Amino acid sequence: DRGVQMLLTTVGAFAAFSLMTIAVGTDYWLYSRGVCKTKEVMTHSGLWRTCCLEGNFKGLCKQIDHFPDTAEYFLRAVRASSIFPILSVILLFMGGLCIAASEFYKTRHNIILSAGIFFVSAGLSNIIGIIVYISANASYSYGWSFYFGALSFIIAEMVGVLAVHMFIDRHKQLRA
Amino acid sequence: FCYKSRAEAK
Amino acid sequence: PLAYEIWMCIVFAYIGVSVVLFLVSRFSPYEW
Numbered sequence A: 001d002r003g004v005q006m007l008l009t010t011v012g013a014f015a016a017f018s019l020m021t022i023a024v025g026t027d028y029w030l031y032s033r034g035v036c037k038t039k040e041v042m043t044h045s046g047l048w049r050t051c052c053l054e055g056n057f058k059g060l061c062k063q064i065d066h067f068p069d070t071a072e073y074f075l076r077a078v079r080a081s082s083i084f085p086i087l088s089v090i091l092l093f094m095g096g097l098c099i100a101a102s103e104f105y106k107t108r109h110n111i112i113l114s115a116g117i118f119f120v121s122a123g124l125s126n127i128i129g130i131i132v133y134i135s136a137n138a139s140y141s142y143g144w145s146f147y148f149g150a151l152s153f154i155i156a157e158m159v160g161v162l163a164v165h166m167f168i169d170r171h172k173q174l175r176a
Numbered sequence B: 001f002c003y004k005s006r007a008e009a010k
Numbered sequence C: 001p002l003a004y005e006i007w008m009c010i011v012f013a014y015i016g017v018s019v020v021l022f023l024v025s026r027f028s029p030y031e032w
Helices: A002-023 A070-080 A083-103 A111-136 A144-174 B002-008 C004-026
Strands: A049-051 A061-063
Touching (some): A002 A083, A002 A111, A070 A111, A083 A111, A111 A144
């Protein structure tokens, strides 16, 4: 049904936005062995702050020392900021606005396609972000925030497919 | 898509 | 032979390539 399709798309978008935002804000990305705070214990090591765990002093967090080779300088810079994860979050937000404007100010038929493009682009941004992060960290297991990010990518691609299919149906009804 | 849309106006 | 992250990203890329090929090949109404 059109109603079910619209509701499923809206729910998916909200979920994807929430998952990515939680992941880009939480600290359980890697689960590595490092120095809690200096000037080598197990750690949390999220995207911005590396909290410490199981050490003589726990809960302490320090901003990861980005920038402790121009080719490596640029990767270091892109990882320093999270332009890619952050851009994924922004794109997902803009997609949500589009889907919301779908119900009001409707009959435009092009704002649904806009939502689809935004969701797909957010996915591509999320994947580039993951590759950059993994490359910058060159035992080391990944935490639940990293997997939240991945789930965001999959949900976003599915919501995008729903949006595109919905736009196609609209233009099929219009041509009849 | 944008090019075809503008042309379809005519 | 390939690290775990390489397999994970191969899967993510497969999903992405498929979605984008579906989009570009099927969204424009002028292709019907």
